[PDB]
Amino acid sequence: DSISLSLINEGPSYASKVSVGSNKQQQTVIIDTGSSDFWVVDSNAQCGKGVDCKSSGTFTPSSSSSYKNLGAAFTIRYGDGSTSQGTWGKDTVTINGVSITGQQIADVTQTSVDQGILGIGYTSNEAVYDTSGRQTTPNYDNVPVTLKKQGKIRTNAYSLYLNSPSAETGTIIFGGVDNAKYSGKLVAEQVTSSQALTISLASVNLKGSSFSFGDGALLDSGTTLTYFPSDFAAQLADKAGARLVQVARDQYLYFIDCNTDTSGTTVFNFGNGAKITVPNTEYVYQNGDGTCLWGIQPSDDTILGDNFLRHAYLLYNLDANTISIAQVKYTTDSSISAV
């Protein structure tokens, strides 16, 4: 028993159709290995200024006969400062025809995000606090845990196939792995955090030279680009020809010439012999105005986002605390086995 769910390549994010409630209200929501809560845009939400938060489906709790309020406030703040607020509830969630009952979700009534987010990370990373760090609700069973508990999948595990940069769709498989979609062997890597789906990144080879790393990297479907500690990003930037630009007061981004040579590749070395190679076009992000962001940016959190993950097949196993990785093979052939 596995559940395949199509991933829509939206550009900066990958989303899936998820139905919520007794009346199967279709939400198109970001699939996010970097967060752990599922929240939906209330039909009466007050989007942030300038934010079109209702064009990817909305949820009306009152037309779902099964919706229950939990009577606790929900607040989340993501790494880029994006926020959502609402209240916690429970309802039926349906993923490609498979329904789980009584799933805890948040009904969001204010958000700066364009659409809801289905966080599928560790329950230990749930956003159960207010903005001051005071807890408002207990940790709880998020979607992957409930899929296992209700007998829909055997293991809290999922495989991520974002597919190629030009692909319109990819696939996430809950409780299964598609052995047709990678070359070599899947290499199981130990997860290096109990809260974040991070594995040890030994080194990065950029423009032919190795740069020693040795620390954890978050394998985040919900991040567009790649983020490294400032000093390391700066060493890579100097090699790549990227420039840190203060785009507004105390706001910095790496830009790179849009005409930069992208013929090469950037190579990521992980444990146990695993290597993922990324084409260098993934590091020139067109802004659409003749300028380009570099695909690496500085952060106090190390993140390998979509520009990396498109080039790997990943089996995340939250019960075994391993993420198995291999160089992706783009194919519509499938050989899906349960995990």
Binding site: D32, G79, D80, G121, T223
Partner: peptide, 5 residues
């Protein structure tokens, strides 16, 4: 975008 820490 950068989705929770």
């Amino acid at each position: 975008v950068v989705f929770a820490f």
